[PDB]
Amino acid sequence: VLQLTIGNSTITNSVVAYGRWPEFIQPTEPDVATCRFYTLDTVMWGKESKGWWWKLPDALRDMGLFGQNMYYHYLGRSGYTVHVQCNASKFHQGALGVFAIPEYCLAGDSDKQRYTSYANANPGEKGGKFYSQFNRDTAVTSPKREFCPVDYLLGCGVLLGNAFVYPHQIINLRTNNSATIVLPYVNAMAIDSMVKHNNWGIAILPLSPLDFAQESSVEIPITVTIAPMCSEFNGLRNVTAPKFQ
Amino acid sequence: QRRSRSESTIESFFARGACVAIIEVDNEEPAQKLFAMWRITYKDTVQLRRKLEFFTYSRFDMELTFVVTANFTNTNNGHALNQVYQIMYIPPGAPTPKSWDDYTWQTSSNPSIFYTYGAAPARISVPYVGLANAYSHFYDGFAKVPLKTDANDQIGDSLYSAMTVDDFGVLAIRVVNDHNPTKVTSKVRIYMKPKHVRVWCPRPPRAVPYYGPGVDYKDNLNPLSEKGLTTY
Amino acid sequence: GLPVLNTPGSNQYLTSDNYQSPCAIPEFDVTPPIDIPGEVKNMMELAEIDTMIPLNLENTKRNTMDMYRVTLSDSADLSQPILCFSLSPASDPRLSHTMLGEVLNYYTHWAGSLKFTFLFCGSMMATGKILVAYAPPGAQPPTSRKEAMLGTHVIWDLGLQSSCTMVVPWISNVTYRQTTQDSFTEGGYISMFYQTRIVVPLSTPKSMSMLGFVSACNDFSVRLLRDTTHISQSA
Amino acid sequence: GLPVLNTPGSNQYLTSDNYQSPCAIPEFDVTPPIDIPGEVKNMMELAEIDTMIPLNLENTKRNTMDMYRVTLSDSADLSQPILCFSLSPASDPRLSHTMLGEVLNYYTHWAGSLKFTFLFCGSMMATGKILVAYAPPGAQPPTSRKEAMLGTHVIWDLGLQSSCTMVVPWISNVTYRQTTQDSFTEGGYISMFYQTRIVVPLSTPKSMSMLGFVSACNDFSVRLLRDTTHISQSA
Amino acid sequence: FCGSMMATGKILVAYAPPGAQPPTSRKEAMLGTHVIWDLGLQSSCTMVVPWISNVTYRQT
């Protein structure tokens, strides 16, 4: 609706998660190097798309100096401002539910429990995608150790309809083309490791299927832009180099 | 406004004692269960687990109540004198019993309860013993990160959503009495009551059967039942 | 010492009692709390949160993402209703598994006004009027617009506002209703009809989907905590 | 007499309870105390006392007097570290059996800053610089000086001062760490490197020995008393 | 933007101070100063390039 300027990045309803604005608690605080909007890779919303999911701060691990501070320091905390952009014409119809889940633990694909690997559990800016059904992994010799989120189960054994208990925003193409959620730092500790722990999960679900006129196939872009807010790090040491394979 | 919400409060919602574990302890001539070690958690049962997982973070003082029920096993006319059960709390790091008469039962610094059968169920209270500022029902992360310089993938391999292997220790339950000529089998049921409960970040309730200590789901993934669209 | 008399009930364990107990870890320095966002002080706070309704529970649509979508169209039969469901916020299949219903299924009694928010997710070039009606119990469940008209109702213009809030006020013979199917504490019915039609121009989707959300109002209250039937454990 | 209700827990013996008991020797004239030197009011007072570290635990050196001596030399490889050990003051073999570690192994949780004092026991004609580094957990354990440099560190000139105090401040995600090996409450690493070298003149020993001591600071605290695993009894 | 009123879109307009590679991709231009411009809402966008220079004056 109005100008949204952070650092050196400006974006032309916005919901504050849990009514709490990001806030600070000698932590290293880059007021400019990290407090800015980083744009994730655009995804394509089609008529056969089940959904998308990203993990924060994992999605910003390779975003400018924020990732460098995240890997160099031991433990850091950061709020976020997520902005989802999806522009469509008056003749397009659809709705996206954008949910910011605290501790968005997801279910695996194998009978073995909690067997998902770090590489698969931390996809980065590409994120992942939900599925209509639960596909059980059958590669016993070389298990994929990847999540198997289910659209209507939200990937966590709960019903999608109740996901609105989480902070949420609905992009309904007939009325609005963008959503904005301001997430504070949510954790059981005032500050925690970012490389191993993800504080937030952004799930975008097509509540209503996309459609345009009488066209058989229609696809429109969705772009996610995340701004770290009041991010502070502590425990400076040699750089961490996670094995992503 | 005259109808109140005194019973919908978080304290009232958890003010009931929920069974979290059943432990079998047998006394017989010394492959055997003369002492049973049970790891402390509410995830062995679904009801209290589901109630707690309504939220993401919690902070509560616990109250444990032990109900012991003993019975004979194929006794003809062999009988036993009233038994005393030792329930010893072993926090992470402390030595664990290897037998029912091990030195660890001395309980020099490990708290223990000696319960006499036929008496009232043994009740004690525990404060908030969390390392962090609140309990984490859901942990979206690992405890180890696999690094490029790791010699093998197993160095950094860790269970997803697992924080610590030894969360809060175990309870070791034995029968202090020596073996009677006839076997006696007892079940100790542990009932956990949260108190002074505080919760944060509400979550939708579980809709499908639990499968393990995590959010994993395996079966019965079609909860909703058939109903007509325009049928009242 | 002091003469005492053991009253009946002694040596019993009532799981709902509130008695002081010895501390197994005395002089423990508990970790102090912090101001974590999202603190919840009442369970009815969760019920007040609107959550989507599985309005459509057909055999080929339930337990999917299609169970939350109700199809509207310009070719629909304007005489027949769009959707119909009883006002049972804990036993009705469409409301039982909602967050409100989930909280209610932990209690035996409920009392308060409900709030149903219907969101139209069609094109901005689609317009129409929808009649959303609540009928208190006692009479025939409205099978026609001429009947649903007679009960409480609201007209919702799709073009102007994409969301409509139908508030169902608390009207009950009893002070509390049961969270279980009971014809004595029956709550009423909710129905939807086409007031005029859905009108769309050319090059526009002629079929659209609407979503439903249910929430509790500030007057809502529950009573007599119990065990939910939704979660079960193999023994 | 007075009606009473026996609450659950009656007739139980909790070894950690604090109840009044009858005196078996009433009216006993206990011997009065005297002002004996060395009164201890807290167990953390003992932990605050510096005690030598078994830094060297090789097969042919452990459980001897050589396990407390770390050999320094002018002929040493300046690229390799002198000594390296994890910051686990109760589970690490080099710190577990220290007085600090002994006190910790009676508790489940610990929190506070540590203090490592390294004493050089060479000739007064020997000079050199030693880099003592603490690396918080999360990254690769420093295998080189260029890496350990990046973490907390101090440079220690042997010629000027024969002892150096490396203080490891309390930096933890959790308010308390466990006294048991746990990757979630991992504390970090401590490493030592040759900043320049050890330089000695002629007629001087070219090989020397350094000693290590560990202590707790005033901010140190422990929690959840437990039984130590160090002492065992044959049953 | 001089298109139809039925056309909508977002444009990322970025200024990158000198020193690094000229942005050949959105992932790079994102890292510098930038503004997002919604065509449907506003038909004109103002990208202000602030004065950031080592020297007090630049040559023409």
Ligand SMILES: CCCCCCCCCCCCC/C=C/[C@H](O)[C@H](N)CO
């Ligand atoms: C004989 C004396 C018995 C002493 C028993 C002390 C046991 C201490 C356990 C306290 C907490 C256990 C249950 C609460 C923790 C929850 O599982 C959290 N959500 C952890 O994820």
